[PDB]
Design a protein around this nucleic acid. Structure first.
Ligand SMILES: [Zn+2]
Length: 63
DNA sequence: CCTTTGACCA
DNA sequence: TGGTCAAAGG
């Protein structure tokens, strides 16, 4: 788990067509905060990863 | 503390 | 067929 500045707890594991790859759902945890993050790969580029942030953090940016 | 995996209900 | 939690280990 790459630490970019937050705490995330991996959750779930499903595969999607059109992009033969398994998706992952990361959920940030914090005493009073809870945000979700999605990570997907690019069919034509297994090295390229996508990150989507849904929500907001109410506990400053950690290490 | 923190994560990998199998099943529900319509 | 989609989207999520829950039991256990170093
Ligand atoms: Zn947060």
């Amino acid at each position: 788990l790459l630490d970019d500045g937050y705490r995330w707890r991996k959750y779930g594991q499903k595969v999607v067509k059109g992009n033969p790859y398994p998706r992952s759902y990361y959920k940030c945890t914090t005493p009073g905060c809870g945000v979700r993050k999605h990570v997907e790969r690019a069919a034509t580029d297994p090295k390229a990863v996508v990150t989507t942030y849904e929500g907001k953090h109410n506990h400053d940016l950690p290490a």
